[PDB]
């Protein structure tokens, strides 16, 4: 419902990552003034892919198995390491390949033959430029409409959906639809299907949203204003400050994640910065954009 509580906040952590939770940057503005944000959870260069992971991703994974979706997003501008933090390398792998580990390990577990659930993973691959929604399973197929259930359900009809068991299988049609993608949103979607075996055979469905966002420099507050990144930061602080109104609809991102967004569901946004000094407008940019609070001292 609207009323009777709060909607559930978006979880804030900024990562700093090495040279290639209130965080203090130099006010280049007046060098008598320092700026304090206050976030959810503080990475600094130490922080390696399994202490984000395990820190802010894998305790939301279990929410999925409750009927609740879930939404992890990588903001901050080009070169800071939004790409490193969600997919990662074979030597180093991100948020994405350890999250599809996990689940699929833990719907092959929750699921197995026997158990009072059966569990189906399927995934979806999406792209948000320009205010279009484009399928990158199946490219070349157009501009896709977003719709609602009557129960609320976000829906996109005839997006591709792939049915997945295995990390092969995940591989088989991430990878190659992986290969402007700096200008772009990258929107990964891992739906849980479950159905009870036995009384009172109930039904559920969780949706993890991976996403690695375009870059931020597309998004310094009144370079260009990228219309999911400006509804995005409208939405957070909506959902964050306890507002009235949150324009889920004045974007095609923020209303693809109407219900992972709010709500009952966990979301996080990492902020991604990076320590050079040619990065210090778009770090101030993506630490007062995701910030959940701000000070002069
Ligand atoms: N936490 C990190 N530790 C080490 N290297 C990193 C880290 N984050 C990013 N990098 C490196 O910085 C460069 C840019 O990162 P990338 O993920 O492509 O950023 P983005 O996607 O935000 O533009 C790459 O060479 C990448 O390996
Ligand atoms: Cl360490
Ligand atoms: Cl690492
Ligand atoms: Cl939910
Ligand atoms: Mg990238
Ligand atoms: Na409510």
Redesign the pocket.
Known sequence: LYFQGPPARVRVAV????F?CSLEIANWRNHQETLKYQFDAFYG?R???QDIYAGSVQPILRHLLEGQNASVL?Y??????????????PE?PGVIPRALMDLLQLTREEGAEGRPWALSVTMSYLEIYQEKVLDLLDPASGDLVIREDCRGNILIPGLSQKPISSFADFERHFLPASRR??RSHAVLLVKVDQRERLAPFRQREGKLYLI?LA?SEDNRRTGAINTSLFVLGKVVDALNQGLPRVPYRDSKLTRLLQDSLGGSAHSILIA?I?PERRFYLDTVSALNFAARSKEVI
Request: glycine share 16%.
């Open positions: 990562r700093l990552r090495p290639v260069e922080s390696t892919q990588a901050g501008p080009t070169g800071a390491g939004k790409t490193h933090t969600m997919l990662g390398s180093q993608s700096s690695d870059g991604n990076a």
